[PDB]
């Protein structure tokens, strides 16, 4: 089959006392793998996600010059320390640094923004509501199939900006490698229109093959984050994706 | 501009070693190294040369990209990993001789000499075979001077694409995590002596970034997992990884 759907991977939820979807897809085989077929298609608010499509925007119009370039604390105190500080794309995407993508969102405008998430394919395509906040308050929604879709292109640097936007998100998404494997991915969570999720979104880098994975799940508080990458962990490991 | 820690010398003592570990703080524009004159002795390069090798390969499109496939010539090597179909992130992943050698041969002589004088890499001489000089030829390069030649890389100053330089950093990539990236490449001289292990390459934080290349007498293939172990324990003294 092209797409499978495993139940079983349910347990991995339900042990948590949680409720999502994983959506697996073996860039070799062109075959998919879920839990849910359902909740795989269901459209959501990207939230941090949208930092993936945001930064290639940005360094595509020349907003963001490099992975290098700083940008300057705005002196207002915030919630999260680390977004107290001057950051770079690379600490940007690490720390989900919002204000810095604000004015990414302000610089490239509603016009370009509405464009290229056309020219992208990337979920509904509608940027309906504020410029600086629509990938958390406003009509965009995206499903884990579709945020594949999006990564797939994104991986084969078939989006339709230059080749060196794509390397330099690719470099920016990375989160963790070691002997076995590589993993670019981003997080988000969808805070402040119903429902409240956690987002993983990424790829597995194997010696002879690449795993693309999305995963969403309920987060009604904060205490559940660390589930989106350990539930997305315990799918790979039971499949001998990761040891 | 270089400050010799002699005490870094007590890493190497603990094992029974000998080496050199050189780093430089690129904010700081500072250099370390228990053994200044060590640091400053060229030696064989081995596979720390696939860096290069990968850089020209690329440039000159010899490698089209990090997903192109060099087939397996179905001849069975020593180490099972090369055994097998491979692309540039892979062959420098586990360091596969045979398809740098092919690589070099593209290459050529000429041009392989002139792009080690453009990168100013080690004595910049290719004396020996075109597939081989870089275990058993000329070429011969330092610790500080593969130090220049990373910060070099780094920044996509070298005389190549920028493209080369990022596919290149991206095939050295070796470890990440919360807390640090680690892009470096490994070597073992095994043909002349001194037989020396080699670990060259940088550690990105979030606000630094540290260069490092370190050589150590490898008498054995026993002892190659101290190259990594011996830095990891200097990174850790000196407060850059946890
Ligand atoms: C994005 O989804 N954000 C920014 C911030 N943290 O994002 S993340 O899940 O840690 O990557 C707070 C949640 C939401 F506003
Ligand atoms: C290069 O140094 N090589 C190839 C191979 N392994 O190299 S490495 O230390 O793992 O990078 C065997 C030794 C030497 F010929
Ligand atoms: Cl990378």
């Known amino acids: 089959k092209e797409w499978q759907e495993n139940k079983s991977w349910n347990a991995h939820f339900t042990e948590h006392k949680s409720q999502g979807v994983v959506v697996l897809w073996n860039e070799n085989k062109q075959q998919g793998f879920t839990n849910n077929l359902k909740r795989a298609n269901q459209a959501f608010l990207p939230a941090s996600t949208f930092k993936i499509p945001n930064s290639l925007i940005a360094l595509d119009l020349g907003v963001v010059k490099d992975e290098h370039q700083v940008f300057k604390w705005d002196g207002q105190t915030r919630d999260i320390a680390t977004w107290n500080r001057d950051h770079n794309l690379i600490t940007a995407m690490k720390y989900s640094v919002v204000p810095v993508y604000q004015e990414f969102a302000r610089q490239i405008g509603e016009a370009r923004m509405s464009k290229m998430l056309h020219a992208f394919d990337y979920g509904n395509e509608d940027i309906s509501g504020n410029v600086d906040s629509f990938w958390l308050d406003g009509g965009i929604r995206i499903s884990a199939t579709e945020q594949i879709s999006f ?23 990375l989160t963790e490698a070691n002997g076995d494997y590589i993993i670019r991915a981003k997080t988000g969570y969808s ?20 795993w693309f994975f999305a995963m969403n799940m309920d987060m009604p508080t904060s205490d559940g984050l660390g589930l989106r990458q350990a539930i997305t962990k315990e799918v790979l490991k039971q499949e001998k994706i990761i040891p």
């Open 151 to 173: 990564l797939r292109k994104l991986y084969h640097n078939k989006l339709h900006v230059s080749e060196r936007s794509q390397r330099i998100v690719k470099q920016a998404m």
């Open 191 to 210: 805070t402040r229109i119903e429902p409240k999720i956690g987002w993983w979104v990424g790829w597995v880098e194997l010696d002879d093959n690449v």
